[PDB]
Each structure stands twice: as structure tokens, then as C-alpha cells.
Point group: D2
Chain length 267, copies 4
Amino acid sequence: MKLTGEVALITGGASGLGRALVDRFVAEGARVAVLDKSAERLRELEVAHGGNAVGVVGDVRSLQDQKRAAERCLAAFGKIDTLIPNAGIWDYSTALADLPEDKIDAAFDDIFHVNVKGYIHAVKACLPALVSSRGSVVFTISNAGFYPNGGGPLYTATKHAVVGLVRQMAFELAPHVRVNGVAPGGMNTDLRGPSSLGVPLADMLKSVLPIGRMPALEEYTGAYVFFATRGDSLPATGALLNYDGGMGVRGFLTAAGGADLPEKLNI
Amino acid sequence: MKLTGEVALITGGASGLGRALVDRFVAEGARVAVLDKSAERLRELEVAHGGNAVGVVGDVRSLQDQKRAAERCLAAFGKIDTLIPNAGIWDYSTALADLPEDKIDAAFDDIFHVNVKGYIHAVKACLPALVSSRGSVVFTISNAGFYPNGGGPLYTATKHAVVGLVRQMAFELAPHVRVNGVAPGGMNTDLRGPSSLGVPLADMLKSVLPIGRMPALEEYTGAYVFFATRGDSLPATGALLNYDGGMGVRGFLTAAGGADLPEKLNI
Amino acid sequence: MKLTGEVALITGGASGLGRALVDRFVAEGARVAVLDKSAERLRELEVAHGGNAVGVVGDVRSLQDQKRAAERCLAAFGKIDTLIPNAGIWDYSTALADLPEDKIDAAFDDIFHVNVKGYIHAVKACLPALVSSRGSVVFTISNAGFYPNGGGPLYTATKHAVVGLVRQMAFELAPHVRVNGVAPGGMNTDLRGPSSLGVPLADMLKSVLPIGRMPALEEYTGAYVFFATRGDSLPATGALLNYDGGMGVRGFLTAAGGADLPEKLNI
Amino acid sequence: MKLTGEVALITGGASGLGRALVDRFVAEGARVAVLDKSAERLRELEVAHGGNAVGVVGDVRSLQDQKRAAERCLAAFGKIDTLIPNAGIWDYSTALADLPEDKIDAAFDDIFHVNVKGYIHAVKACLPALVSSRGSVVFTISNAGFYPNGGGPLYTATKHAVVGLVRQMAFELAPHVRVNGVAPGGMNTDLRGPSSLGVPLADMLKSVLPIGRMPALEEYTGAYVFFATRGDSLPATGALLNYDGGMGVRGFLTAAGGADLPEKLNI
Ligand SMILES: NC(=O)c1ccc[n+]([C@@H]2O[C@H](COP(=O)([O-])OP(=O)(O)OC[C@H]3O[C@@H](n4cnc5c(N)ncnc54)[C@H](O)[C@@H]3O)[C@@H](O)[C@H]2O)c1
Ligand SMILES: NC(=O)c1ccc[n+]([C@@H]2O[C@H](COP(=O)([O-])OP(=O)(O)OC[C@H]3O[C@@H](n4cnc5c(N)ncnc54)[C@H](O)[C@@H]3O)[C@@H](O)[C@H]2O)c1
Ligand SMILES: NC(=O)c1ccc[n+]([C@@H]2O[C@H](COP(=O)([O-])OP(=O)(O)OC[C@H]3O[C@@H](n4cnc5c(N)ncnc54)[C@H](O)[C@@H]3O)[C@@H](O)[C@H]2O)c1
Ligand SMILES: NC(=O)c1ccc[n+]([C@@H]2O[C@H](COP(=O)([O-])OP(=O)(O)OC[C@H]3O[C@@H](n4cnc5c(N)ncnc54)[C@H](O)[C@@H]3O)[C@@H](O)[C@H]2O)c1
């Protein structure tokens, strides 16, 4: 019940991690506005959280649809405390040599407009409200914003670019608006890619994830609730939380190094 | 109450951030065991929190002291869920040039034994318990573990060394024990030093903290509660949470970049 | 002469750092092909360096232009050993708030196509050659790829995005092609911007550069020579060389910390 | 021939990487002073480089032996341009659960005194000369200063601590002395450990090193020559070069991702 009386705006929140955030935020007593391209999923989200959540049909690439979202949130809930730019697009982990010449330009535009420009526009549109509420921006990043092999050249670059947005916007919006970033990873997603283009579980636990399990979307919502809590994260700005099961602390031969511990410590 | 039923062991928790963490963890429904060398201040928290806080007097540099703290935590509460190695000493930001040639060796030992060895000895002492509970470690680092001018060569090195403890212990203790770091910064505590040695934050704020204010000790507890909440931080291990008012994302001329922002929007 | 027999392709090398790199690489015994949109300045270096430098006029945003540069390099010199994507555009450090709502979309495309896509298209065009020679890529990043206030949201994001290109391309092109980044900082160049938009470094030095001086363009070439020397940088891939006069290690009050050091030692 | 007329002091340079640096530096026309505990190897080094190199028998843990080294270098060569604190001790990659209780204290003291305090004392002793020569410090670090599994809790912490020394000393010694760090890895070493304590090639190339080979000590010397070159690294201070074959950019399942490239690009 950390988010009583708090109002969030979450982009791309009609499915996947975005939807999980909505469901959790509403359950934490928050009021949530969602900008997404999916009309029928937005209405589905609205009836699932009657009164607490409102959906606005639009494109995150459009600044005017971002403004419509910010305007609709203010109209319905009076304020915007926390902004979660979350809408993202994958590149099917396509390598540079595997990107066809005749498709490489449009693929760049698509992935960068949704992944970076969408985040730029979202903060731009909600800025007046966030300065008024003295709130915070929590960007959804990725392990592909810190490490390779979590996407091709396109997705990795877009996700490293939002890390730059975390740092720059934290500087720019201070002392009024705090800007932080969560970088999730090792999820179970129905994440899609551009129209221009087109790891086994056993290998994922032994070599990719030290934690030795692939958590559900619900387990990735806690990080956002923390950043959106009124009195829990005031000192936090420019913060980067790697939330990927330990992809950056994985070992050379095996992901984890303490699987023997229980029977080594005689428990 | 978010930590109901949980048990924490915090070192250096009789004053400053540590005490604030004790207060907050008890208030959140958890039970806290505290290792500190200050006898008077351990009694102070004992009467304050009743049976929910046990104070064990000892030095963090001593392993058998650390083990005695782990014993008492198990005897009083039955388990250990979250270990918070927090006990730390400062070097007054004494430069290498200002370090006396006869005081340097003893000052190196003093600061590294508490700041790094005491962090090692705590995990070592609590390892069988934390493995049993599938619990987690949360190190108190500092801005001095990431950027210079937080302390001198000694303090900076020690706080950088615990960053190494975060990464190595996150690998070594996986999959059962998650290991994370919080790095507080804008604090204003009576952080003491070595008896082998001899500018206020407020006087320099607009060059240090983009957040534009000085957060209370209480405001730094939320990050630890997060890493202590099992249903909120499961996919987090090896994570480094910069919690320093944005010291690492400050500007060149001034710390914050948007002093004249509310007038650009007419708020 | 350290680069005798080697062949380099540098983009944006008709002025500033790029030209300095051309000058230095030719002086070190190598032969340089240059891609730039400035026709006059490409002629200027052609007469200066004789047959050892070929200028190809084109846009880095265009892949077939990039391929035409790779063709001409092979036609003139027979191979490509070191590719230096360097062509870059600035945003005048224009804040998100100061970005017009009608100029933002076109400014995003302008800056990201040159700064990120032009870096992608260069490697893509030169990949068959660099794989053939077991050569290496060296990206020109910036302090804005690591810390804020180097540019606005756009430039910072782009320069952070190339950091992602370093990491992903270092993985994708291994074991045959090493991929590294240099990040210059204390430069003083006529770094232009997008035609969709409208404080000197010297005026702010003691807050910016710990080195206490402004290095000439020539002084920034040595890092690239290093990554271009096969017998000197073989174990280097994915390396990020901060080359910014120490912007990331500056103090809070002043950039440098030992102004009064020679008197503490009586020098 | 980059180092003509340059004078270096390198600690622990009687064997391994240190010795390789001496041999290379002398071959680059540099004059080298070496502080090491091995008397017979120092004299062996001296006769191998007659006139250009001078050896001083002492302990890096001793500040007075560091002062003797700095004094002997000045006496023989008149100046100290570059200091390379290189003397280090491994921990046989011993995990925390594998460190015996009765040995953990002395092991900490030994590894931290050589690895961190030695570096502290070296800079301390050469400081007067380095301010006079306006030179630079180049610390030898390790991949274990950035990533886990390159050592146990002890070695990883010591190597992360020197990264802190790079950042702090770069701040402290500016604008006169530049402070940088090289972090080598994937070497072929006879590196030893403490008396308290006590990866196959195929697995090392497929999972550990993207470059797909284990280079000789000679290939790791180039990075140091760059930092010690008079006019090649003036803008460089606080710089961290990961020089480990790409350990930090390695993939999830395989170290490299472009082994198919040659026959994919039809060469
Ligand atoms: N796949 C993974 O495991 C993984 C790893 C790291 C990071 N992430 C990040 O998680 C975040 C959310 O992922 P998800 O699982 O919800 O993906 P998803 O595809 O399930 O959901 C994405 C949502 O964004 C909306 N959307 C996409 N483009 C839009 C546009 N242009 N305008 C408006 N709406 C748009 C879609 O309608 C969809 O509802 C993304 O930013 C992704 O980069 C995922
Ligand atoms: N002071 C700041 O602004 C600041 C900034 C960043 C990080 N920190 C970190 O905060 C952490 C908590 O300390 P604090 O800031 O509250 O300072 P503090 O001095 O108020 O608290 C330190 C506690 O550690 C205990 N302690 C010290 N040495 C001990 C030993 N050898 N054995 C047992 N107990 C010992 C002390 O009794 C005290 O209760 C420290 O690790 C410090 O590095 C402080
Ligand atoms: N200005 C600074 O102080 C500073 C600081 C850090 C990093 N940098 C980086 O240095 C790099 C080199 O640029 P510079 O500083 O010499 O500035 P510059 O403007 O002098 O050089 C840029 C060159 O790129 C060429 N160019 C620009 N757009 C092009 C295009 N679309 N197609 C082909 N060529 C194009 C220009 O003709 C010019 O010759 C840039 O990537 C910049 O981001 C500069
Ligand atoms: N093993 C690897 O592949 C690896 C990986 C990363 C980093 N490194 C680093 O490389 C550096 C050099 O390694 P190396 O191969 O030369 O090791 P080495 O054991 O071959 O050489 C170390 C030298 O240091 C000297 N020395 C040690 N302790 C001393 C003391 N207290 N006083 C004086 N001299 C002392 C020894 O006499 C020896 O000559 C070390 O700092 C090590 O941490 C090695």
C-alpha cells in the first residue's frame, strides 16, 4: 500500500511489463494513466481497474499523442506524480552482418523512434505536470543498456541511449524532478519487433542468470513501486538499477558460483 | 508494514544511517539484531524497540564477534533474512600528501579492517544462515565508491573495494543469496575516523547535490527496505544503487541544471 | 613511424579531430581514406598529404556512400586495417525544455542519423574488409557518452548509444575484428548542428578540466594511434577510453584537487 | 621509439608483466628503475639492460623502501616521468566459504598491503618527483577490478580498490600529475599468493576471451607505453583501459559472436 494517492503515467502498458506495472500500481492504491497503440487492450485494462486506471489510444512516437496522454491524465486524476516511459521494441537480436542493406535504414528509424524518441517525448509532454507535482521519471531500460548480446546493434544502442537520457534528464530537471532508470532482464515476454526484420531455458539458467530462475513479470514491478513511493526515494536521482537476475555479475564457466553452498555449509 | 516476519542483522546500527535502518526495519514489522562497539547507544535502541531489537557489543574487525552477533540473532529470532554490513569509518577526506609518513600504515589498517574486512567477516559469519533462508546481503557503499572527492585515497579505495565485494559475492553466493549495494551520499552524519589522524556539505550544496536539498537520515532507509522485501527485489543481485542526491550526474557550473525551469513553463 | 603499411578509413575527417587524425595517421606512415560531406576541405587535405590521402565526398547517413568510401579505400590502397567512425553533429547543449515541439522530431532524426546510423553504416560497409585484414574499429565517442552536461538530451543519448555500439560490435565482430571507443572531451572545435535549431570552455575550465589546460586537437590523436597499432593493442576490445581531461574524476568545488601541492612539497 | 629520454619507475618488475614492461620500456629508449623483493632477478634485469635499468631491493609494503626506490631512481637518472605501481598478489581465486576462519585475517592483511597499500606508498614516495617532472601514474589493475570470477573476495576487492585510487589520485594530483589505470587480463602468468592460503585453455577461448587467443606478456606492454609517451596522452587522466581480451563484452553462450563471419561474408 505504498502508492496511496499517487498518480502514474505509464507508456506501452497494455501488455507485458507495462501491464504488470499497471496491475501492481493499481493494487498499491495508485491511479494510472496508460498511453498505448492497442485500443481494445486499453479498454480491457480500464474495466479491470475501474476508476483507478484510464487508457488513451495513441503513438509514443507522436508528441501530440503524448500531450493527449498527459492532458487526459490531468483531466481524470488532477496530477502526474510518476512517469514511466516503458514502451519498447526489440530487434530479434539481429547481428549487423544479418541486417539487410535495403532494410537497415527503416529498421533504425522504427526502433529508435519508439525506444528513444518515445522516451524523449513522454518526458517532454509530462514535464509541466512533473515540475508541478515535483515528481519523478522512471525509465524502463534493459540489460542491453549495459551489456552486449541482449540484442543486435540497434536494440543495444537504443537501450544504451536511454541510460544517457537518465543521466542528462536527471541533471536537466533537477532540483524539481528526479530521473531514474530500471534495467530489467531475464523476463518471459511477448516482445515484438519492426516489420523490416524477419536462448533455451537450460542454457539460460546455467550461463545467463546467476539467480537460477526466470521470474514472472510481477517480480519486476517492485523496483518501480520503490521509485514511485513518495518518501522512499527522495535522495535517488540519476540512479541505475540493474534488475536482470545478475547478468553483469555472472561467472566465466557458470552463471552462479555457489550452487554447492547448501551441502558445503552442512545445512 | 512490508517486512513483517523478516529478520535483519545490521552492523554499525547504533547511530547514524544504521540506527535509522534499525528504526525503519522495526517499524516495517521486522526484527533487528545489531552489531556495534558503542555500548550506550545499543542500550538506547533496545529500550526504544523492546524485544524487537537485540544489541550485541563487539568489533566488526573480529570474526568471532561477528559470529557472536549471528548466534544471538538466531537465538533471539530464529533466522537471518537480510544482512546489512553498514559499519564504516571516514578519513576526513585527508589527501595522500596530508597523510603523515608514520601514521599512514596504521591508518590504512584501521580504515580497511572496519570498511572492508568487517564487511567480509559479517557475510562469512552469516553465510550458513542466509543460505538457509535464501536471504540477501545489502552493502552500504558510498558516492566514494564511484566518484572521487567523497573522501581521501583511503576511504575512496575502501568504498570502491566494497563495490568489488558486491560483484564477487553476488556471483559466489548465487543462486541462493542475493548480494546488492546501496551507496548513500547527501547524508550529514558524525562519521568518525582513526585515532591515527587529526568543509560542511551545506556550504557547498549547489556544487554537490542536484536534488537541491539535504535529505534526512530517514530518507535513506527506503532503498534497504526494497532489497529486504523478497517479493519486490527477487531479480536483483549485483545491483549498485547510487543514492547520493545525484552526485554522479551533476553539471559543471552548478549541480542542478533546471533552476529556471518553472518559469520556462509558467508554473 | 608506428603505422607504416597500415590503411585507415576515417569519417568526418576533413576538419577538427578527424583532420588531426588524418594528419597524424599519414605522419605515422599510414594511408588514409576520408569520408566527409565537405568538398573544399577534402581537397585541402588531398594536396597536403599527396597520394597518401584520398577524399571521397558523401553523407555518412547514406550506406551506399559509406560503401563507396570503402570501395575507394580498397581501390587506392588495397585494404582497410583501421576504421574510425568519427563524423558527428552537436545539439548546442539545448535542453529538452528549449527544444521546440515542431523542431524536435526532425532534430532527433538529424542528430541520430549522423551520430549513430552513420557509425552503423560505416562498420557495415567496411565489415568484409576489416574481417579480411583482422583489423579493428575505433569509435569517437565523447564525455557526453558517460556523463551529463556535455550536450542536451539528443547529443547525450547519441553518444551514449555509440557506447552501446562499442560493446555490441566488440562481441559481434570477435574474434577477428576488435572494436574500441575513444571519448575525447577538452576539445575546442567548431562542432556544428542541425538546421532545425538555433558557454565557452575557457570561461569554465576550473570547473570542467582537472588537467588545468586546454589540449590541442593534435593531443587527441595518440589514443587512436594506439588502437591502430596491431602490436600494441591486441588484447583490447570493448575498451572505453575516457579522454576528456578528467571530467569524470573532477571535484565538487573545483575540477582539480591539488592546486596547492608544489608548496606542500616545496618544489 | 616513443620513450626516448623518459624515465619510469616500475614496482614488482623482476618477473611477469612487470619484467615485460621493463624490457619493452628499455627497448623504447626509456630509463627504468625497479623496486622488487627479488635481489638476484633484479641484478639479472640490470645486466640485461646495462645503464638503462637500475634495480633496488625492497618491499612495496614499506614506504621507506619506496622512498629508497624513488631516491635511487633520481640519483641514477635525474627524474621520474612515469610511475607504474605494478606489484600484486593473487588469492588462487579462493571463495569466501573456502577461506578458513583461522587464516582469513592474515590473508586480508597480506593481499591488501601489497595490492593497495603498495600502490598508495609508491605514489606517496614518488609524488615530489612526479610534480617536478609533471608526469603520470599508471596503475596496473585487473579485470578483477571490474568483473567477478577473476579472483576471490580478497583479490577482487583489492583490484576494485585501485580503481578507486585511479579516480581519487587523478583528482588529487591534478593539474600537475595525471593518474590512469590499465586493467590487463587473460595473461599467461606465474602469479603467486599468500602463505595463509593453500581454467582450461579450451574453456578460456570459448567462454572467457572473445579475442579467441591468450596473448603473451609482450602484447600487454603497449598500453603502458601509450600512457608513458610524452605527447600522446596529455588529455588522459582518470582513464580506465580494460585490456583483457574483451571479458566485459563477452556473450552469454559463447565469448565471441562472429566466428562465422569470414565464410558468411564470402571471403
Ligand atoms: N524481452 C525481455 O525480456 C526484455 C528485456 C529487457 C528489457 N525489456 C523491456 O521491457 C519493456 C516492456 O516490454 P513488454 O514485455 O511489455 O513488451 P510487449 O511487446 O509485451 O509490450 C509493449 C507495449 O508497447 C506498446 N507499443 C509499442 N510501440 C508503441 C508505439 N509506437 N506507440 C504506442 N504504443 C506502443 C505495444 O502496444 C505493447 O502494448 C520494453 O521497453 C522492453 O524493451 C524486455
Ligand atoms: N557521512 C556521510 O555523509 C556518508 C556518506 C556516504 C556513505 N556513508 C556511510 O554510511 C555508513 C554508516 O555510517 P554513518 O554514516 O551512520 O556514520 P556513524 O559514525 O554515525 O555510524 C557508524 C557506526 O559504526 C559503528 N562502528 C564503527 N566502527 C566500528 C567497529 N570497529 N566495530 C563495531 N562498530 C563500529 C559506530 O559505533 C557507529 O555506530 C558508513 O559505512 C559510511 O561510510 C556516510
Ligand atoms: N567539440 C568538442 O569539444 C567535442 C567533444 C567531445 C567529442 N567530440 C566529437 O568529436 C567528433 C569529431 O567532430 P569534431 O569535434 O572535429 O567537429 P567538426 O565539426 O570539426 O568535425 C565534424 C566533421 O564531420 C563532417 N560531417 C558532419 N556531418 C556529416 C555527414 N552527414 N556526412 C559526412 N560528413 C559529415 C563535417 O563535415 C566535419 O568535417 C564528433 O563526433 C564530436 O561529437 C567533440
Ligand atoms: N594472473 C593474471 O593473468 C593477471 C590478471 C590480471 C591482473 N594481473 C596483475 O598483473 C600484475 C603483475 O603480475 P605478474 O605476472 O608480474 O606476477 P608475478 O608474480 O610474476 O610478478 C610479481 C612481482 O612482484 C614482486 N613482489 C610481490 N610482492 C612484493 C612485495 N611485497 N615487495 C616487493 N616486491 C614484491 C615479486 O617479487 C614479483 O617479481 C599484478 O599486479 C597482477 O595483479 C595478473
